[PDB]
Design a protein around this ligand. Structure first.
Ligand SMILES: Nc1ncnc2c1ncn2[C@@H]1O[C@H](COP(=O)(O)OP(=O)(O)OP(=O)(O)O)[C@@H](O)[C@H]1O
Ligand SMILES: Nc1ncnc2c1ncn2[C@@H]1O[C@H](COP(=O)(O)OP(=O)(O)OP(=O)(O)O)[C@@H](O)[C@H]1O
Ligand SMILES: Nc1ncnc2c1ncn2[C@@H]1O[C@H](COP(=O)(O)OP(=O)(O)OP(=O)(O)O)[C@@H](O)[C@H]1O
Ligand SMILES: [K+]
Ligand SMILES: [K+]
Ligand SMILES: [K+]
Ligand SMILES: [Mg+2]
Ligand SMILES: [Mg+2]
Ligand SMILES: [Mg+2]
Lengths: 527, 527, 527
């Protein structure tokens, strides 16, 4: 395939045009007074979004040279989103600033690689200053404030996130889902709920709600399928001798045993119910073992130390205070396992979490830990249509990510003032040569961009706002929603440190390497 | 397919246009003050590179006559890269110089073949002079300096390469890999690590880290799969009699033996663990034998002198001071084999290396030698994004190749001064006729190109720099980064001899044959 | 498919245009001062060639009428290459001369068929004169001179070819192969080497080089596969009784016999090795029989007079002074067969060569004869890249073909003087009518073309050179490389007679028939 080659200023200008287009599209969404972007979808209704990475990923250019800069800015935004989950618009604007200022300074005598070295040095100094300015989060009010700021000033979302974190802990499992009503809802799931229904309608004993409900029930855990009458009769005899209900959690129940169970339930009133084992693969075994420790029972059919159903004993069965089974899910609430064994299992899970990490494995381990310790939380997002619901879920996810980041690390001032307060740290550096000085100056000029963008979206002159902020005391910043100068921490305009440093590092890392190019090679368009 | 034919000057001009385009694209990247090239990729983000062969391979031209010269220059760069692994930009610029000067001298009375003969004679003389000027490498400081120069002035890369060579030897196994952090890392792997995990989680005996760890363990090596209980029981009896752990490295472990192992481990505390054999094919047998000599044991199930598991004896088992097995890899650290047998095995491996050579076979033999003698080194390259990591891995690989070349042979001056100092050797030649004189003069003029290119990329007049260098003493050269005239060896601006001679030889060999053409035949473009 | 028809002068002019284009392209490569042609390849790097037939085969024209002449000239060149393997450029230029002069003489009253008859008569007379002027080759110096002239003045190629012919004979087997070094190499393979390696690594007994080496070994030749232990044990018993090594050359060795062999070799030190039979099909049987006569043994498993392995006797085994077996090839060096039987086998092979001839059969018979009599020679061609190596192999192959032709027949003067010295023979002919006189004059004018072309490529006026040559004594010719008038035979500027007569005959035969056309029919181009 034939190719086209460009040198120097023309190539730099075309790439800067692409970068400027993508960054201009992204920048309109930043701050409390930003606006939304509508993106055409090929299979239905368009998206309406206020999210930087979503807007960035949706733009592809016809010209081959502009698309290079567009793709690099997309890489910046995607890396920021993957690492922190928030702060992608800030990263995009910082990257454009660095790229433009770098391109403006290239000449015959310049050495772009040394300029890149100076840029990296300055960014390291800035990150050190940011880490020195951070403070830890200690109160639920700070959690609510962070969530409110991340959700674009919505107090209800912050309140619901704070309540969820209070109920399931600051490191618990919280998920976001679509709602079917006009309003948002918070649902707390306690105990062990594994989403498996009763095998046969004949086991129902509660008319209102169509539920099978038992109290003080024996639990029979079977790793392998139950088929024969010989393997099932002893458990029924044990249960009937003591006059207690029995819940059989097993891989499956076959025709003969199921027929015996239904016949006894119908003609004797025997209190029994059967359910499938949850999870597939080794996860099924892990869940069954977790239930075994939780209820104080044993697992039958294990490959190691195989325990036979034929000689089941009364002490091999778990005990649960309440069992609720319905068509879609089942729940055992109050097990009777030994606390020490449960704590040992929790310790084993949290140690396994630290050994090898993957999204699937981490998700499963966290779910197991939550089911065994504290429970899970579900936030249901409401709205009148799919477009509104998706738009609001974007903000809810941003708020959750920001709150987790602010729990892992501290908080700094919001509104772009945190980066403004790091400018004095760059005045202490002594560059080795002229190119590193150029890089340091590039970073020093770039550090003002976020506050100016926020002020510009608000309809005021950003440069005057930044000048007045820099002339005030360290605790004072600009409230763009109210349009005033206030004490940022007292008003709750705060940001996570991790998001800020991640955005700065990614933007600098990509833009400084972009500004070192001299030749660009592209493919000639096909017919 | 119809074809087009061109004669003489027009064809030469078109081919020279193609050569000039490709060489101009490549030349911008040369020296401490060179710049990068951005190459569009059809499946994602573009590449940013400062590597000559990568840039050369990426250019294809629409015109059929320019593409011929482009392909020839690509051949030059690819041959230089395959032979030395470094110095491709120098080869490209030398090839362009030779081609242009050769085309300028063709006339009615000229004989291009004799000009080629003279060019080859001059190149042979120059290589002889280079070999006379070389000096061996003796100190780690020279290794660090060579690595630093090859990595574009990065001192950390040179230091890490020097440390790796000190730890595993100047001819050990060093590999380059992607990192997941901001900084580069050096990892030394000792003993015998073959990347096979424990078969069953039941064998774990260490909670923190999820590891199976033993001290003073017996090792049972099985070439063939272990299935039956009779073949496995005797080894367990031998191990239990002496109260020692047992690690079974075998092709595989089947249901019955695995059940026995897990049952005994769980209900008795028997200290056992089992793992797969590493490598596939004859490599598996070779690895098993290597472990056998290393630990002083024997291999069961060999086709020749078959040794049966049923009559295993205490002296047929290896002994290892430490065994560490986890989900992904296993390691035996301190074997108890006889030193003489290990030395004999090493000698056999190094003799096999000299008989027949292939990339796969050489890689496997080197890995076996390293595992048995000294260990391996891994350099993990860090960065904020994939583009930066790839760009830096390019330089790390260049530095490794240059250091290996400089260990095989000596070193000469850098900055292009080595070829400048060979010009006086061409003044001693007596050509047989006029055409060979023309070729000698072509080479004499070409010998100045690298230094001029390095000076030009630095923003100064290259001809004056070369003139001042040639008027100075033999030890003085031009430092382009500082912009001074210095003692090259004291500053550490040095090059490998092999890279220089390889680049010169390849460039001359291809360009001199290019400059002998009179007719060019191409295919007419299709619709 | 519709067709276009042209008559007379227009068609002749278009065909002559095509002929002239192809011949002009080919002619630039002729003589010591010819130049090369670059041909585009669709799958990689272009070819650089100085070979007439390669250039001719690469040209196809868009116009349907020019392509006819181009294809006819291609036929001339291909026939010359297939018959003699050299002299294709001379044939091309002669064909163009004949075609142009024939077209110039066609008029209303002319009879082209009689002109063709006269051309053939003149060519027959010229060939008779050439055969009268030839002299046989007697000394190795003449061989070296012929090879040097054919290789475009390269003395090293001529020397290496002469050395190879001295070592393996003037009619031995010599092959040309790619080298992996900068310089050419000559390798002589003696004895019987059939390129089959040892079956099992266990048979190796020499560490340095990984070889299995034996002296004074028995040879067991088996036509059919060896599977059972009964068929193999008797040979081992016979070998062990006399304390001698044993090499088993067989179709294959199966599991049981191979296990016995490896076990005995490992636990007893029994000196044995086994190898596959070389060649496939009846060639395998022929090779096995050849080895049988060579070593004085017998072949087991033949369909006729089947001889059983179970009753093998000591006198049925061959004896070889030295056996060398490695991973890739095996060699038996000094057999002990009866000389009379070997001579009878050689006589049978050389008689079979004369009965039926094909390239495959002739190649196999020659290889068998060489392995049994004198050995083979391999010339490895060196270079820095594939293009140079291919370009040089072209010349090496030309030199080999020319030397073989000059050994079959005599030699004449080079530089085109041989055809110049045949002009006086055409002055003795008496034509029957005017058309035959026209043909004789056409040939007489054509006989000067090669010398004029050689002089023209050298940058001088060819007509004056030819005039001065024709005015000198018979032994004087023009040295174009030096640019002088010399004694051709003393300087070594000589040609094979066969090449000259073949080129003349083919060129005349095709061109004279081309010049008889009046109507041309072609197909109308498609869309
Ligand atoms: N009322 C406010 N006054 C001043 N600054 C504010 C106010 N509310 C939010 N900010 C600041 O605005 C920025 C938040 O902008 P926004 O959430 O749109 O962009 P982002 O986090 O960079 O990207 P993303 O689209 O991924 O959320 C943060 O600097 C926050 O401190
Ligand atoms: N500070 C310096 N001063 C002078 N010359 C230098 C300096 N640093 C490196 N050089 C010289 O620059 C050349 C290295 O250039 P570079 O590595 O870009 O090209 P290359 O090795 O020919 O190709 P490749 O792209 O394969 O690495 C060598 O001649 C080295 O001696
Ligand atoms: N030094 C020389 N002086 C004069 N004539 C020479 C000299 N060297 C070679 N020749 C003549 O040049 C001709 C060889 O040309 P060349 O080998 O290029 O063409 P060809 O044999 O017709 O074709 P091909 O391309 O197949 O080899 C022969 O006539 C040879 O006698
Ligand atoms: K936004
Ligand atoms: K470079
Ligand atoms: K030729
Ligand atoms: Mg946000
Ligand atoms: Mg380099
Ligand atoms: Mg020839």
């Amino acid at each position: 395939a034939a190719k086209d080659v460009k040198f120097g200023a023309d190539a730099r200008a075309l790439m800067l045009q692409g970068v400027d287009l993508l960054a201009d599209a992204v920048a309109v969404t930043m701050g409390p007074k930003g606006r939304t972007v509508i993106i055409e979808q090929s299979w239905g209704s368009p998206k309406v979004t206020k999210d930087g990475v979503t807007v960035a990923k949706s733009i592809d250019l016809k010209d081959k040279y502009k698309n290079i800069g567009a793709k690099l800015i997309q890489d910046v935004a995607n890396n920021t989103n993957e690492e922190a989950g928030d702060g992608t618009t800030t990263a995009t604007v910082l990257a454009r600033s660095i790229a433009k200022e770098g391109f403006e300074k290239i000449s015959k005598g310049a050495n772009p690689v040394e300029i890149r070295r100076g840029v990296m040095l300055a960014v390291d100094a800035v990150i050190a200053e940011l880490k020195k300015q951070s403070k830890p989060v200690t109160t639920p009010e700070e959690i609510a404030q962070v969530a409110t700021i991340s959700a674009n000033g919505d107090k209800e979302i912050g309140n619901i996130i704070s309540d969820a974190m209070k109920k399931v802990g600051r490191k618990g499992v919280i998920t976001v889902k679509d709602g079917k009503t006009l309003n948002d809802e918070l649902e707390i799931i306690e105990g062990m709920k594994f989403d498996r229904g009763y095998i046969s309608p004949y086991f129902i004993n509660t008319s209102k709600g169509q539920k099978c409900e038992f109290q003080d029930a024996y639990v029979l855990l079977s790793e392998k399928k139950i088929s024969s009458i010989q393997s099932i009769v002893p458990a029924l005899e044990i249960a009937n001798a003591h006059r207690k209900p029995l819940v059989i959690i097993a891989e499956d129940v076959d025709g003969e045993a199921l027929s015996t169970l239904v016949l006894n339930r119908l003609k004797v009133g025997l209190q029994v119910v059967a359910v499938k084992a949850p999870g597939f693969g080794d996860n099924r075994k892990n869940q069954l073992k977790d239930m075994a420790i939780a209820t104080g029972g044993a697992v039958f059919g294990e490959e190691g130390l195989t325990l036979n159903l034929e000689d089941v004993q009364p002490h091999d069965l778990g005990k649960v205070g309440e069992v609720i089974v319905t068509k879609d899910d089942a729940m055992l609430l109050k097990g009777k396992g030994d606390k020490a064994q449960i704590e040992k299992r929790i310790q084993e899970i949290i140690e396994q979490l630290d050994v090898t990490t993957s999204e699937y494995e981490k998700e499963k381990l966290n779910e197991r830990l939550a089911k065994l310790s504290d429970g899970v939380a579900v936030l249901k997002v409401g709205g009148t249509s799919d477009v509104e619901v998706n738009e609001k879920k974007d903000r809810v996810t941003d708020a959750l990510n920001a709150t987790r980041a602010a729990v892992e690390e501290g908080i700094v001032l919001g509104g772009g003032c945190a980066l403004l307060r790091c400018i004095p740290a760059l005045d202490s550096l002594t560059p080795a040569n002229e190119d590193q000085k150029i890089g340091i100056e590039i970073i020093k000029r770039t550090l003002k961009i976020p506050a100016m963008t926020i002020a510009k979206n608000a309809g005021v002159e950003g440069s005057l706002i930044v000048e007045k902020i820099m002339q005030s005391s360290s605790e004072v910043g600009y409230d763009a929603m109210a349009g005033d100068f206030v004490n940022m921490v007292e008003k709750g305009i705060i940001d996570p440190t991790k998001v800020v440093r991640t955005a700065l590092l990614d933007a600098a890392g990509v833009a400084s390497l972009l500004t070192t190019a001299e030749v660009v090679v592209t493919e000639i368009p096909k017919e």
